Design a protein around this ligand. Structure first.
Ligand SMILES: Nc1cccc(S(=O)(=O)N2CCN(S(=O)(=O)c3cc(O)c(O)cc3-c3ccc(O)c(O)c3)CC2)c1
Ligand SMILES: Nc1cccc(S(=O)(=O)N2CCN(S(=O)(=O)c3cc(O)c(O)cc3-c3ccc(O)c(O)c3)CC2)c1
Ligand SMILES: O=P(O)(O)OC[C@H]1O[C@](O)(COP(=O)(O)O)[C@@H](O)[C@@H]1O
Ligand SMILES: O=P(O)(O)OC[C@H]1O[C@](O)(COP(=O)(O)O)[C@@H](O)[C@@H]1O
Ligand SMILES: O=P(O)(O)OC[C@H]1O[C@](O)(COP(=O)(O)O)[C@@H](O)[C@@H]1O
Ligand SMILES: O=P(O)(O)OC[C@H]1O[C@](O)(COP(=O)(O)O)[C@@H](O)[C@@H]1O
Ligand SMILES: O=C([O-])C(=O)[O-]
Ligand SMILES: O=C([O-])C(=O)[O-]
Ligand SMILES: O=C([O-])C(=O)[O-]
Ligand SMILES: O=C([O-])C(=O)[O-]
Ligand SMILES: [K+]
Ligand SMILES: [K+]
Ligand SMILES: [K+]
Ligand SMILES: [K+]
Ligand SMILES: [Mg+2]
Ligand SMILES: [Mg+2]
Ligand SMILES: [Mg+2]
Ligand SMILES: [Mg+2]
Lengths: 422, 425, 425, 436
């Protein structure tokens, strides 16, 4: 029964063609949904009660579109998101962090606009986790956004939105200085021929997967759901194909910001992503990611590939990793393990930000500290296990891979352990 | 010999990649498609696309197959649609560069436990009006196909039956249905109501893969460019859906309300044409050919053996085309199953085979009407040169190009056993 | 039948990985195909008798090597005459006649920088006596090959030059030497004295790989069955060395003292024949063909394009043979470079090309002696039938087998362009 | 180039020219062959063990010290000839030569002692002489038995029973020497610790032209099973009288290593020949060249793909450690082992990194020479009070011994494999350490 679920006959196929032939509509997904959902906040999704339903439906990142609304409007949206998120903090083993992303208005006819400088400063003052920078055309646009965030916004992730021909042509220099990329298909489909957008999307997703940096697929994914309760056949296919392409995140804009079915749109993206993740051909994907990733002398990078290889060898239910900044979890995520990456962290911001990386399930550690560091590490690992049991990730008898470091502080991950549950 | 400009077009840097991941990383929006569009477009005929003048514009835009939806309209209404399609197609007989065959497909209303009384009458109408294809609605098992085959009376055994898979039972009994069908249609409209909407992509990808493995045509259908019923431009999900159906391996793509009742029927056909051309150049032939080759069983059938040899030869020299002589379309279908990058130019004397081969990806039919030569080898040579000269006229070929030519050792269908490498003079 | 798929290591051939291929090798799986790696036997006092030479031809000797490091011109002229008398004693039965090439192995430069005066005289002797091949000793650079070619003069343009790589400089300048040579000999005797003995296997494997990539013949030579100079059976290391030279990709294997001066010349030829047949069935064609195909560059030469198409067609139908008509041997060499499992039966009127194609693995030359038919198409068909009738008599073919036939569109060398699937009747 | 560019700038172009690294980075086996270079020098320690047969040419203590220095890892006693008194003296001379280097625990070289049985002869099973010779082996503490003419699983059970309760730790390597042994290979390997391709008798029992098929098949199946396989007989035969081997002999040694053999053997070459030390030196030189020419890219991929999924933590840690070692070009994998099993499971994936096995068992240190790429270090210190400190001391002993021996350099990365509790069977940890 285990080998009939989660498209396991298709996963064991020797060729991609045979993998397709073995896909089964009766093979139910069992793993937790790994592709994060970004929902745009607006009039249809601003109330605290509506936001609680969206969190339950699967929203991981709340997007605030600074192209519309005042600073007062966006501050109220942030407060409502935080109130809805903290309403579930009473059960720390099931609490779900939700990131807050600021999407800039853009340069317009201009580099960095004066309104963007003010909006970026608002973001730093209100503690946003991510910036989706509109119309990034070159590396200096990213440096300008970074400078506008100042010293107090050093930890904010900058996701560059590629929306025109120049952004596509200068992609390599933009990705090098960005934390990740958004394939902003709305403007891209107006700036370049509509029939070429899929090429730009597939290329950028492939390059981001190669670089190990998050990539978001955005705009008109479930467009018809703005007025209709069910999406079109092209819309469900688009969501599934963005996941199969290798996108870390999928997004909803008008579907959640102004549409009549914001919760249903989140539920639909969740349902499709789960089905598409099980249909991923890990046999070739892992082989290619492994082969393309360069040789490294960084112990976090070396431990990460060793841990993902170990996870596939034993069909590990999860890889539990301790992380301060999210980096050790990101390096595991880049190899696309089938095992869920359960990231235990004390940083509330890192817990929100790792939603950008596919297959990373953040757990915010709020248990009392231990006097001996080795005991404190072990307790964080046991917390990962208990949260995993409660959420359905783990059961007694499962094998897990545990990734830790040799001393406190970020940058010292160097250990991988094979543990039997209970 | 060919130049650096040649190797920058049609996604050739992405085509030469050693891994699928590197192939994706090398896809270039500035690399323009050069090859003729190989995925056929099926357009549904209705009030928005019925007039002879509108049909001429749809043929020019790229429509290869006209679909008549027998769920609506009388026999008199459909007979007039057939006459208007034939009048629009024959209006281009004066120009060899613009004349192109267009198949006529009858889509049945559907079942009741099996074949309905209306379907028996509509299938009889199809035989009497010389339709080329039947898109059989709600096929659930092999006996449904046998009932459609029996209803095609004594005169319609040459009509192709494309089984529409629209429910859970059709998906589960897919192998037995494909075995007795000429091809399959992934009818996503009803499929998305009969099974959970989030599972349709799995059924589509599975059925396309199995049809590619069997070497039988597969159609992707319904809501591909839905928003174009009222809007002049499609959504980002719609262009992605069309491109991904081609990348999945679909032989044909379809338009329903977009061309039958919408405000932009011609623009919807133009959009499918533009996307299909871009997506065909983005196909990773290096792995696709290797897997089709490895999965296809060993064969002692000379047509099957010649076809793989010809496709291998075409890839070796970057052949501009594979010219094949075919009476039933079968030799062209066996070339098409290996997905060559070279266009398969099929020269035939059968008007029906010329229309029907539009079901097979990459097959460009040429109807030959010259009087037969007394010496059979001379008649073969005349047809081969007719393919070469039509290719030069349409932009497929130029002097100095290499072409692969597929023929048999004697007249009559079933004897394909020869592959030749020719330099165009 | 199941019995067919148990022989010639077919379970090991169908394996998905090289490791599983090794695990499936079976000592009870008997070889069925004809031995494809040519045997070169050095002529000397143990192998000069016309009667002894007839036994060596029957045992499998394909090329007779004359070592010009020993003996006078009178001694070598007598060896040539005895070889030709033994070879022509079988010419009365043209369907079974086996051509045998004559190769002249030069003394070398000695302490000199280039072509020695003795080599100039020996090369002129070779041209005057009609030798087919020259094994040029101690080739260190491209200009050494040009000097050998100039010493052969205008009458020796058809002689094949196989460069012997015997020292560090020859290994380092391998690419420039191979470019101007017809092929290479890994002359392990001197190589194992010029470079550390423990590094010879690296030079052998590298040169064989580069010759296979270039599609040019490579010979593995020296001490392959050394102990058989005095003992009736070879050592375990010797049988392993012969098998591994075949698995490495060598076109030819050689015997020196084993046939020139030893007590078991015929048994040494029989031993190389037996090992080579076993090792050829153990070749993992699944990966080898894929890699040769992928590494071979794109080509606009129709002979090259027809050759890959024919080898692909042969693997698709498990063809017993590829019958090719050839004037110079080139069309057979281009088929041989893809290492088909099917025997390449090369039918030629050139007695010299029939002898020289033994340098290419898997090429079985048939010398056609009939004068040309008045109708060229009939002359082509008669030669193909001669290939089939010889193939039946020799055990290559049976009624019911499929064969690939490779021909050209006009008389004369350089116009091969046709591949055809034929059933043996 | 992008997959090695950062490491090329850091380690240098000279690093990537040695140990056949251009051939190792090739995308196909054909390109790997084309890139093999006679000027690319081997850098790694020799991983394929050398078994030398002891006889009149190699019996003296002084000659044995030279053979240990030349690279002999296993001493073979052929019980087809000589009395029990003769073999006991050979064992004592081997032990005296081995213990002459014990003064420096950081360098000492353990040498295994293997007893090769006379065989069944015309009998159907275990002979009476074999029962007595096997009891002699247990009494004299031999590490391995090379069991002659194994034809079925019951033959190895008979050898195991003849070793008694005191010989439970002795490794049984079954010699496959006839058609029945080849046909019943799977049942024999299942109950054996390893296999010897005994080509001498095999080449007489089956056609000589088929021996290479049996050798390649048995090596492949042993590699798949993760059990040691020995290639034996006439590898350097001409060196019995000549100082240099033939071209076929060097090729045979190189191809046995490329086939996947864990051990290579010398019989008359060391037992009675005029050049026993030179024969060991020649096998050492060829094995190092051939090990660098192994195409690890496909070999590791195929071993990984063919090995079934496992829930054994030692097996899971081993694959993770070998993958980590390839990712960083690790100089070594240091493993703590009681029985040798954790080192054997690392060895089955054929890492390029040396497997330095730290053990307190003198017998396990001798026996791990059967596994390719395992370098045994015998730890003699008494246990620390805190188990975690004792584990750390053993890891540091491996690192310090490794640096002092040129296996590790400052700046190198090493992978360290340990367990969560004392005793055999609990290996479950992999660590990445930087050498300072
Ligand atoms: N991102 C991503 C990165 C790496 C690997 C992978 S992989 O393992 O999943 N897969 C590789 C094979 N390719 S393919 O193009 O060689 C193809 C081959 C067929 O034999 C066929 O029949 C259809 C296809 C095909 C092509 C494009 C598609 O989008 C598609 O759905 C199928 C598909 C992706 C994904
Ligand atoms: N000529 C030639 C050219 C192309 C292909 C071929 S091929 O198909 O026959 N070949 C496949 C690759 N392997 S391998 O090297 O990846 C290897 C893998 C194993 O799984 C194993 O068990 C041992 C080996 C092995 C064997 C020989 C070597 O030199 C070596 O380095 C490793 C070699 C054989 C031959
Ligand atoms: O992923 P990051 O940011 O590098 O953090 C990983 C770090 O977490 C740890 O496992 C635990 O560190 P702390 O005890 O400081 O939380 C370290 O050993 C390791 O260096
Ligand atoms: O694809 P099909 O229907 O089998 O037709 C292929 C046939 O066409 C030919 O090439 C030409 O035949 P005709 O002259 O009868 O048209 C035959 O030799 C071959 O058998
Ligand atoms: O292999 P080569 O030397 O190019 O010879 C192949 C030639 O043999 C033929 O098949 C027959 O030619 P001939 O009739 O002159 O012998 C030609 O059509 C072809 O060009
Ligand atoms: O390789 P083996 O025989 O399983 O031994 C590995 C064992 O060695 C250790 O690393 C150390 O154990 P000891 O302290 O008993 O020597 C254990 O944790 C582990 O189980
Ligand atoms: O800004 C965006 O998100 C877009 O244009 O798609
Ligand atoms: O009938 C159809 O085309 C459908 O249901 O998609
Ligand atoms: O000349 C030769 O053949 C040699 O040196 O091996
Ligand atoms: O017994 C042996 O060692 C042999 O036969 O090779
Ligand atoms: K915005
Ligand atoms: K209908
Ligand atoms: K000579
Ligand atoms: K013995
Ligand atoms: Mg935008
Ligand atoms: Mg329907
Ligand atoms: Mg020489
Ligand atoms: Mg023996």
């Amino acid at each position: 029964a285990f080998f009939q679920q989660q498209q396991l006959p298709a996963a064991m196929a020797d060729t991609f063609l045979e993998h397709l032939c073995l896909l089964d509509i009766d093979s139910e997904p069992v793993a937790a949904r790994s592709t994060s959902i970004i929902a745009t906040i607006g009039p249809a999704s601003r109330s605290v009660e509506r936001l609680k339903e969206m969190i339950k439906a699967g929203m991981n990142i709340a997007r605030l579109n600074f192209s519309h609304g005042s600073h007062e409007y966006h501050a109220e949206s942030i407060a409502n998101v935080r109130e809805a998120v903290e309403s579930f903090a009473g059960s720390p083993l099931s609490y779900r962090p939700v990131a807050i992303a600021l999407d800039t208005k853009g340069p317009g006819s201009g580099g960095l606009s004066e309104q963007d400088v003010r909006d970026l400063r608002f973001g730093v003052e209100h503690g946003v986790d991510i910036v989706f920078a509109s119309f990034v055309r070159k590396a200096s646009d990213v440096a300008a956004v970074r400078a506008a965030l100042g010293p107090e916004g050093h930890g904010i992730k900058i996701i560059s939105k590629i929306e025109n021909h120049e952004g596509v042509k200068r992609f390599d220099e933009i990705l090098e200085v960005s934390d990740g990329i958004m394939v902003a298909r709305g403007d891209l489909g107006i700036e370049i021929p509509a029939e070429k957008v899929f090429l730009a999307q597939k290329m950028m997703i492939g390059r981001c997967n190669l670089a190990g940096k998050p990539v978001v697929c955005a705009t008109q994914m479930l467009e018809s759901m703005i007025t209709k309760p069910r999406p079109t056949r092209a819309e469900t296919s688009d969501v599934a194909n963005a996941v199969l392409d290798g996108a870390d995140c999928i997004m909803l804009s008008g579907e959640t910001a102004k549409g009549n079915f914001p919760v249903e749109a989140v539920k639909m993206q969740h349902a499709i992503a789960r089905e598409a993740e099980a249909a991923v051909y890990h046999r070739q994907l892992f082989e290619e990611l492994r082969r393309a990733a360069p040789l490294s002398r960084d112990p976090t990078e070396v431990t990460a590939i060793g841990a993902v290889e170990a996870a596939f060898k034993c069909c590990a239910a999860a890889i539990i990793v301790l992380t301060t900044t999210g980096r050790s979890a990101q390096l595991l995520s880049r190899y696309r393990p089938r095992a869920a990456v359960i990231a235990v962290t004390r940083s509330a911001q890192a817990a929100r930000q790792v939603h950008l990386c596919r297959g990373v399930f953040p757990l915010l550690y709020r248990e009392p500290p231990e006097a001996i560091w080795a005991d404190d590490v072990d307790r964080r690992v046991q917390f990962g296990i208990e949260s995993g049991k409660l959420r359905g990730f783990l059961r007694v008898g499962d094998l897990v891979i545990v990734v830790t470091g040799w001393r406190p502080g970020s940058g010292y991950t160097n250990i991988m352990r094979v543990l039997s549950i209970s």
